């Protein structure tokens, strides 16, 4: 089991607690193979998640979650741990706005499961602060 | 110079180190009477700037700054300083995102000079996080 | 997926990483829902693994690795990380020793898949410190 | 009176706290000549100690106690204090139990006053951590 | 608005929260831009102030009060945020106890507004520590 | 050996590293019984000490060192370790410079081997902040 495979399957089994059926997305901070904060795709801490009152529409858009990547941030902010220098292992590449925050944070290093369109900005901003995006499967892991 | 004035007037001051000139916002986050952390409206470290190579523009607005009020929040992500039970002052009340991250973060209080209109999903956000929102005026201070 | 599920499912996960064949067991230390540190079963750092170069044996059993339980203690130390008020879900029942330890760091939960004769001396520390034990499985969950 | 001198005379002083007679054994971790945790042979904080209920037999052997080295890394692990890149007093050479500990949890020498046999794996890890072992008296101290 | 000139600002804000008034004297600690603890020239926490009870005066001094950059490093003890390696802005050049302090705590460099007669012993600490002090206005900003 | 006599022994130890032979101090900052800092009487780290270079001779006293008592919060605020709510134990009740600072820092008692005559003003201050003073002596100990 490698350790690469590890943290994806970790992503995986994380967003398996997504409270927006619209999205199930999962994401693990990781500094020097150490898992220090994950997240997944839900509302705010002790308020309503849409499995239960329904979704918060706007413009089309379910706006009432924190997204995955974002929500890895805000542990790290809430609980006064370092995100400076870690990667991050996502289950979908991140929308523009997280992937903004990752770099400002000091990720440098995002592995994805899957991705649709990356924004070209992020690319650019991937490209100026040096910081590598790579694909990588979920492993087929069996538990139970 | 009371603590809200300092805080207001800090908020003030924060803003004007923007470097997009669309909007010129400033966040101070307080724990205990304590800054902790600051934003203000700017690209992601170490790349470009409005200022320098003009606005990212999409479907009408700039979309290359991380907001004050993130960046405020993120500075204690890299760092690793606690945001939890702390309170903020910003010169602008925030967008429902900011609003989402601040409030996951363990914000307890948005004090604010100039808010515009509150969107519904805030104050229901709010009301459920029991979080105080104030408006305060930055307070008349001359330097030098 | 329910939080207890979330990890035990991932004491099984580390659990696979052991670098001993005589046992492979998976340590998850948690905190407000938040995983802070794990272990599985492996030599120290940076030295031999039974896998490479054989066990160590005397007097019957392997010495060469650090339990499991052990190894996720020695994270929080090392990383000088708390593991005060804690709780942790393990594979399998820990050692007499491990078990010492873990009360001794402040751990005051133990959630365990598979124990087989718990120590009376450990029931009788379990008692003194309030410390919970509980049996729980690990889920059917397949990845990828 | 030297760094060294004042460390194993600090861990000389702390072994006197021992409630367990059949071992006063003394551990003080250090870090650039600061005390940053300290450790003697007792049970588990809060239980029964055998200075009063009496030993806790098993194999010939007491096993009630936490040794005095490891009760240094979990003070580290209980209070999130970093134990890495430190080195340690001791008034006795430590068990291989602990010596894999206290590799593990980053410890980078090792200075003993007493040592009976050390253990030819302890040897070999040390070896391979690179991580030096010496001999140093308790310096004549009196005080009061 | 450049960052020298905001952090003087600073200063010259939180000196106006002085409690004494025979010293307005205000004090900002940095690392890497930014603010992690301010002081300004006030007596212990929750004791008299000057302003209400009138001076504790001794040899034709008040000392009542802690000083402003005494109180940033105290700020720095009393919550457990490192003080190494930053530098610190200061109203007023420090008395010599306060740069002895300043100093031991891993100040870097002092940048001052006014100052009066620099101590010719904390003159020869400076150059001992290879700790530049350099003089710097502050910026005339109106805020409100 | 009681927890007392360990902290108050461990005092008069470190008092013999000063290097200032006027005056031979030491101080102990403690939080749950452990030692969390230490100081004596020196002078700036890195800097000439009086052993080597004589006294800083000013107004009839040596103004060369940091005293004991500050040296052990500068301590804390170095390495950024918390002072708030600790003990501390000295060799000498501290002078009133340090008696407002170690308050300030959050300490909650002190406890001292030889005080001569404790200023009315810090009784005042140790009064408002609740702060208990207690005379207590250096065991008798013999170590080697
Ligand atoms: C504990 C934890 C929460 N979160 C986020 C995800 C959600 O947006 C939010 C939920 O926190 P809570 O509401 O406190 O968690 P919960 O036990 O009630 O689970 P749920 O509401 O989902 O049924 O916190 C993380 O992202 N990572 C974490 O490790
Ligand atoms: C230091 C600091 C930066 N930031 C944010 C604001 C910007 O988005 C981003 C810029 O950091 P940097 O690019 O590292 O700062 P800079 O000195 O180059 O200033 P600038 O680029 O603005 O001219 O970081 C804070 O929000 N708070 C802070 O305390
Ligand atoms: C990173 C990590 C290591 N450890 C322990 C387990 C092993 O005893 C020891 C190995 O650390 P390393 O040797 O540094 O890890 P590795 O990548 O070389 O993997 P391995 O040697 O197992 O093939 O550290 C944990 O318990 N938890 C953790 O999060
Ligand atoms: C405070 C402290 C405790 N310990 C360990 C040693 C013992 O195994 C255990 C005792 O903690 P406690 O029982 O909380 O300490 P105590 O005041 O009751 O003293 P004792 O029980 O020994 O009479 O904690 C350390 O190793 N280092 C420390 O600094
Ligand atoms: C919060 C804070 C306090 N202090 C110091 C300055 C004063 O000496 C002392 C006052 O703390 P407090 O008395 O707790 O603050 P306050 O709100 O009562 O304000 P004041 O008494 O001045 O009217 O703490 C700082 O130096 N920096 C800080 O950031
Ligand atoms: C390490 C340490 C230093 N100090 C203070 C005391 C001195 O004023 C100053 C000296 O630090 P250093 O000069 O770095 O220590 P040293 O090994 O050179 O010893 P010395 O100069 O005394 O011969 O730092 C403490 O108060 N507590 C501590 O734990
Ligand atoms: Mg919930
Ligand atoms: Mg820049
Ligand atoms: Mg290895
Ligand atoms: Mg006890
Ligand atoms: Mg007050
Ligand atoms: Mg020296
Ligand atoms: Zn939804
Ligand atoms: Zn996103
Ligand atoms: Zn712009
Ligand atoms: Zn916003
Ligand atoms: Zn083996
Ligand atoms: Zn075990
Ligand atoms: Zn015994
Ligand atoms: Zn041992
Ligand atoms: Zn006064
Ligand atoms: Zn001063
Ligand atoms: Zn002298
Ligand atoms: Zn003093």
Same mark, same amino acid.
């Given at each position: 089991?490698?350790?690469?495979?590890?943290?994806?399957?970790? #992503?995986?089994? &994380?967003? $398996?607690?997504?409270?927006?059926?619209?999205? @199930?997305?999962?994401?693990?901070?990781? $500094?020097?193979?150490?898992?220090?904060?994950?997240?997944?795709?839900?509302?705010? #801490?002790?308020?309503?998640?849409? +499995?239960?009152?329904?979704?918060?529409?706007? +413009?089309?858009?379910?706006?009432?979650?924190?997204?995955?990547?974002?929500?890895?941030?805000?542990?790290?902010?809430?609980?006064?741990?370092?995100?400076?220098?870690?990667? &991050? @292992?996502?289950?979908?590449?991140?929308?523009?706005?997280?992937? $903004?925050?990752?770099?400002?944070?000091?990720?440098? $290093?995002?592995?994805?499961?899957? #991705?649709?369109?990356?924004?070209?900005?992020?690319?650019?901003?991937?490209?100026?602060?040096?910081?590598?995006?790579?694909?990588? +499967?979920?492993?087929?892991?069996?538990?139970?």
């Amino acid at each position: 089991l490698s350790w690469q495979d590890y943290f994806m399957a970790n #992503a995986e089994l &994380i967003s $398996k607690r997504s409270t927006c059926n619209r999205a @199930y997305v999962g994401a693990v901070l990781v $500094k020097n193979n150490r898992i220090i904060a994950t997240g997944y795709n839900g509302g705010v #801490a002790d308020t309503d998640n849409c +499995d239960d009152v329904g979704h918060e529409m706007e +413009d089309g858009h379910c706006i009432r979650t924190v997204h995955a990547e974002m929500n890895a941030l805000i542990q790290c902010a809430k609980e006064g741990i370092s995100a400076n220098n870690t990667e &991050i @292992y996502v289950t979908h590449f991140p929308c523009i706005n997280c992937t $903004k925050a990752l770099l400002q944070a000091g990720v440098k $290093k995002i592995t994805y499961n899957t #991705a649709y369109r990356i924004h070209p900005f992020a690319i650019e901003l991937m490209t100026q602060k040096e910081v590598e995006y790579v694909q990588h +499967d979920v492993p087929r892991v069996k538990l139970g």
